[PDB]
Amino acid sequence: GVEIETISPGDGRTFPKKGQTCVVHYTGMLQNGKKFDSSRDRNKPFKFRIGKQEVIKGFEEGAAQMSLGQRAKLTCTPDVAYGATGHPGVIPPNATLIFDVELLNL
């Protein structure tokens, strides 16, 4: 259950495919309002490949459904997230995650 709202036009027709790299500048916040991660604070694009279960399923599905030059906010349910086995000292168990996702290339 991922809800995507198009906050950017994203006229690019390119779509991610299997076995491809994908760069996203992601910013995540907990639904109360505090953030835990921001790749842009590191000034480095987050390179991840579609598949291989490198990232949670919600983030990968959201990145797959949205395209180049597009921005969107992903509503990640705890079922598709860490859930009960939350991140140690970072994310409390049974919490939702909101991501500021955007491709730059591929």
Author numbering: 1 to 106
Sentences from the paper on this structure:
Ryanodine receptors (RyR) are >2-MDa membrane proteins that allow for the release of Ca2+ from the ER and SR, thus mediating a range of Ca2+-dependent processes. Each forms homotetrameric assemblies of ~5000 residue long subunits. Mutations in RyR1, the skeletal muscle isoform, can cause malignant hyperthermia (MH), central core disease (CCD), and other myopathies.
With the expected functionality of the R615C mutation confirmed, we solved cryo-EM structures of wild-type and R615C pRyR1, under nominally Ca2+-free conditions (5 mM EGTA), in the presence of FKBP12.6, which was used as a bait protein for purification. In both cases, one major 3D class was obtained, along with a smaller class with poor quality that was not further considered. The location of this residue seems critical: Arg615 is situated in a junction between three solenoid domains: the N-terminal solenoid (Nsol, residues 395–630) containing Arg615, the junctional solenoid (JSol, residues 1657–2145), and the bridging solenoid (Bsol, residues 2146–3613). Nearby residues that form potential interactions with Arg615 are Asn1678 in Jsol and Glu2175 in Bsol. Not surprisingly, the structures align very well, with the differences only found in regions that are generally more flexible.
